[PDB]
């Protein structure tokens, strides 16, 4: 899209204020710049000479153009073989971003036929509209009175069964929009329905590439690798995605932003994110002691107060349409009452 258009703009947030705290702590100035891509950095064979190389922030740090990766970098085994690490500042796990009759007409025809032969039983027994409005009072609430009270028992037991199966329809049979983590059997053998994906060239892809027992998920997310997580948020807001493997507190902050964003139940791979560092350097011991000093006090709670800690029945399920139907039935019956005006 934009090959070479690099401008100075204003950056702020969590790690920016963390670096401001570090500059307040120690004896240094700094120079904040960005990375050329939206990728952490993966080890891949370059096409010439058959050699595995890196890219991204690891490719820019080892090239000497950078000095310190101040980013929530994924700590794993392969990165520590080449560079050194500090104490982690972030501690979080992994999660999934998701998005959150005719029989009555038969009973009506039955009570119409019941009313008809009750009117017939009134006729054969040694008046008309009185029995009509009496049936209008009965169905909703001397030989004909016995059938009327037996049918009133029928009416109460039918509306009791109606209450029972409406409660059954609203409590038990609920569609599971959640996934409950990796242990969903429909995601173990996926299809074109449940769209789960991840960031292109992310460390989660390498972490699942080491896990050879779920290689089918490795062959499924490769068809839907996105460049940035904002693309995944834009695609899941427009209902193009269905699931997204990502860290916990970032999706919790996005759930605080947008209430429709829901995390999953399973909390696995409880890992930590630290600051990307160089090799053996005089900025290792002092900086780690400063990070531990930031851990021991309530400055982590202050950084939570900046962004992390701060956040941003109804009885209208299916009776709003019934409410409109009642209003429309009253308006439609007003014309029949005009017919009753013209009749009398």
């Amino acid at each position: 899209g934009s090959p070479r258009h690099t401008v100075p703009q204003c950056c702020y947030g969590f790690c920016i204020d963390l670096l401001i705290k570090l500059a307040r702590t120690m004896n240094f100035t700094y120079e904040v710049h960005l990375v050329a891509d939206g990728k952490f950095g993966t080890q891949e064979r370059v096409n010439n000479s058959n050699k595995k190389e890196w890219n991204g922030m690891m490719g820019e740090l080892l090239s000497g153009q950078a000095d310190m990766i101040v980013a929530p970098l994924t700590i794993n085994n392969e990165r520590a073989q080449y560079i050194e690490f500090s104490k982690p500042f972030k501690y979080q796990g992994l999660t999934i971003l998701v998005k959150k009759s005719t029989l009555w007409l038969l009973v009506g025809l039955s009570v119409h036929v019941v009313a008809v032969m009750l009117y017939l039983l009134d006729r054969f027994s040694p008046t008309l509209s009185s029995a009509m409005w009496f049936s209008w009072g009965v169905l909703l609430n001397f030989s004909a009175r016995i059938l009327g009270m037996v049918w009133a028992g029928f009416a109460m037991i039918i509306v009791a069964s109606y209450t029972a199966n409406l409660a059954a329809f609203l409590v038990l049979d609920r569609p599971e929009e959640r996934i409950t983590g990796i242990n969903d059997p429909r995601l173990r053998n996926p299809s074109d329905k449940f769209i789960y994906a991840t960031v292109k060239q992310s460390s989660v892809d390498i972490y699942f590439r080491r896990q050879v027992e779920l290689s089918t998920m490795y062959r499924h997310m490769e068809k839907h690798n996105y460049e940035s997580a904002a693309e995944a948020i834009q695609a899941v807001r427009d209902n193009k995605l269905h699931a997204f493997i990502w860290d916990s507190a970032v999706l919790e902050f996005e759930a605080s932003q947008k209430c429709d964003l829901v995390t999953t139940g399973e909390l696995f791979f409880r890992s930590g994110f630290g600051i990307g560092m160089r090799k053996d350097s005089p900025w290792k011991q002092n900086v780690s002691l400063s990070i531990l000093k930031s851990h021991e006090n309530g400055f982590m709670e202050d950084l939570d107060k900046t962004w992390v800690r701060y956040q941003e029945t109804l009885t209208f399920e299916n009776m709003a349409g019934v409410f409109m139907l009642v209003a429309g039935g009253i308006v439609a019956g007003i014309f029949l009452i005009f017919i009753e005006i013209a009749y009398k």
Binding site: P88, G137, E296, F323
Partner: protein, 261 residues
């Protein structure tokens, strides 16, 4: 004293067991990378009625209009209508108007399904089981002075512990109020929390999570997941200059990065 006296004075090599990490311990020896996330914790024990009112006035107005067309139900239809809202067969007035009978029958079926929805509301409130939280964390208003409330509650820590050092580096007045509230045994503090000899207890997070995960009946309830707490980790303490640190770090990253941990 203890494991610090064994490792710093070089009577051992490394501390594999559990150990909290603070500033001076990281000054005297070199910890490894943290593998488990173990912090600290504290153990303790609208328009619906508006639109109903609007359509109630609409139904009453239509019934009064039809009664003015075709013996006391002008100003008295409110009691009949709002009594047949609740559907309890209260003797009110004999219905003679056809519009009144049909419209109040439709309104009564709407009231029957409305009370069915209210029973559904009660069932949905019953399914949602509450989990109340008295103390939110270390920044509680209770954790300033127990004289603010009329029963003075009590809470303490483990003796000669690093939690006491974290309190004395955070709040020395908290240590002053804990000085009258000291105890000795972890199981003694557990029995004091169960029987009622102690209100709350400050300890580490994951050990109390394991004790609550095997407790008979789960009477004691934890507080959060370390949100207003320290939320630190445990590493492996090695001496300054040991060449074994890199291999142990690679082995820990192998143990975490495959699901075996």
């Amino acid at each position: 004293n203890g494991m610090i006296g064994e490792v710093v004075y070089q009577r051992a090599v490394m501390a594999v067991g559990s150990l909290t990490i603070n500033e001076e311990r990281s000054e005297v020896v070199d910890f490894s990378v943290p593998f488990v996330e173990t912090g600290i914790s504290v153990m303790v024990s609208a328009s619906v009625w508006v639109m109903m009112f609007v359509m109630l006035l609409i139904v009453s107005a239509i019934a009064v209009f039809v009664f003015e067309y075709f013996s006391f139900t002008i100003g008295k239809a409110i009691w009949l209508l709002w009594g047949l809202v609740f559907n309890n067969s209260v003797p009110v007035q004999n219905p003679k108007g056809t519009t009144s009978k049909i419209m109040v029958s439709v309104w009564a079926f709407f009231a029957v399904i409305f009370l069915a929805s209210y029973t559904a509301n009660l069932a949905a409130f019953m399914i949602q089981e509450e989990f109340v939280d008295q103390v939110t964390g270390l920044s509680d208003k209770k954790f300033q002075r127990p004289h603010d409330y009329s029963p003075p509650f009590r809470f303490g820590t483990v003796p000669n512990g690093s939690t006491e050092r974290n309190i004395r580096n955070n709040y020395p007045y908290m240590h002053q109020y804990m000085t009258r509230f000291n105890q000795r045994g972890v199981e003694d503090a557990l029995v004091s929390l169960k029987t009622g000899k102690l209100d709350a207890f400050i300890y580490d997070a994951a050990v109390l999570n394991y004790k609550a995960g095997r407790d008979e009946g789960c009477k004691l309830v934890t507080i959060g997941s370390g949100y207003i707490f320290a939320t630190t980790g445990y590493g492996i303490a090695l001496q300054k200059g040991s060449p074994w640190k890199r291999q142990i770090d690679l082995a820990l990253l192998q143990f975490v990065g495959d699901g075996e941990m």
